[PDB]
From Swiss-Prot, chain A:
Belongs to the LEM family. This is Lamina-associated polypeptide 2, isoforms alpha/zeta. It comes from the Eukaryota. It is found in: Nucleus; Chromosome. The N-terminal part contains two structurally independent, non-interacting domains: LEM-like (also called LAP2-N or LEM-D) and LEM (also called LAP2-C or LEM-B). LEM-like binds DNA while LEM interacts with BANF1. The C-terminal domain forms a four-stranded coiled coil. The modification N6-acetyllysine is found at residue 165. It comes from Mus musculus. The gene is Tmpo.
Length: 195, 205
């Protein structure tokens, strides 16, 4: 009857908690990306290499060794976008595995319930596991949301530096415009009183 | 007990990522039909932010013009802006999918408990529980599908990020334009920005 878990026990409106998650990440778009290493462990050396931010080949660096400040900021933005997306992928990968196990468990319980509705205790034990898996999936979905919000914030931060790189305004005004909170809609939000 | 749904796990995930990476400079697939979202709020959030005319006008007026320089970064700049826009869009799409995933996950858990109560009370209602479980079975496959779509969107974002960085790092790289073109459009393989193609143009120490 009352199962239990250690976790959370033509229009599709956006959930209010999703909006809140996005808005809070966007209050400070230039921050470190949350690690997902402990909750969504990467399952292999291959995935591991493919998930890490790709390095600039030494071969290319050999042929290189005042927008340099811009160049570093743009690189950082792109690196964070990649990192936020890699994390979302790691989570999605975990979700796939869980969705699958949950599916196998449902069939199992169905098979028990069918073979004479009396082995309730067994089927109810299996359902208790599925219920937990469902809670986990809902939590994983909110983590995916958070990562997307971070990726969107980094993209935005990058475009802010890019669009201000050639105009002649004090570093103060440029910095103010670049770190300002983001609300979606427009790139700079709208510092009406720039001067 | 015959459950059904109308339409190498790790291997499958790798395949999708690799397929998207064969052409990193490409338009993103739409999620509007499969993962529709509504509200003035989500519309503002999901669309790539645009530069406002008052800020754009201000930037322009503060942008000096003359002959001299001649080295207009315009090209590179457009490539970088496109990469960051695509990164935003790929992420926003993954967000729409995630939103649906939260909804389905929560619905699935309410159904599981409903089935639990049925078989907990008078087990005789086997067919009743089976119909509830048949629905949870579908929701679970939906979730697996959504997870693969999220993986796809993430791979696209990573591809776009990598494209942006290839243009950024080749900018002041003292190599010919033909070599730069080749490295930039090469398939992305992970590990390094140009790995898999780099050696075909520059040997290592």
């Amino acid at each position: 009857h009352s199962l239990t878990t250690l976790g959370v026990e033509p229009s599709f409106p956006l959930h209010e908690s999703i909006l809140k998650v996005v808005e809070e990440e966007w209050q400070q778009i230039d921050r470190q990306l949350p690690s997902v290493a402990c909750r969504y462990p990467v399952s292999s050396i291959e995935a591991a290499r493919i998930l890490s931010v790709p390095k600039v080949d030494d071969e290319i660096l050999g042929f290189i060794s005042s927008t340099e400040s811009c160049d570093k900021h743009l690189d950082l933005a792109l690196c964070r976008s990649y990192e936020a997306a890699a994390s979302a992928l790691q989570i999605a990968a975990h979700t796939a595995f869980v969705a699958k196990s949950l599916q196998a468990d449902i069939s199992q319980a169905a098979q028990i319930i069918n073979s004479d509705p009396s082995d309730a205790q067994q089927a109810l034990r299996i359902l208790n596991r599925t219920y937990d898996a469902a809670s986990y999936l809902c939590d994983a979905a909110f983590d995916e949301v958070r990562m997307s919000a971070c990726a969107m914030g980094s993209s935005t931060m990058g475009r802010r530096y890019l669009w201000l790189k050639d105009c002649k305004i004090s570093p103060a005004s440029k910095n103010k415009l670049t770190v300002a909170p983001f609300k979606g809609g427009t790139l700079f939000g709208g510092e009406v009183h720039k001067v």
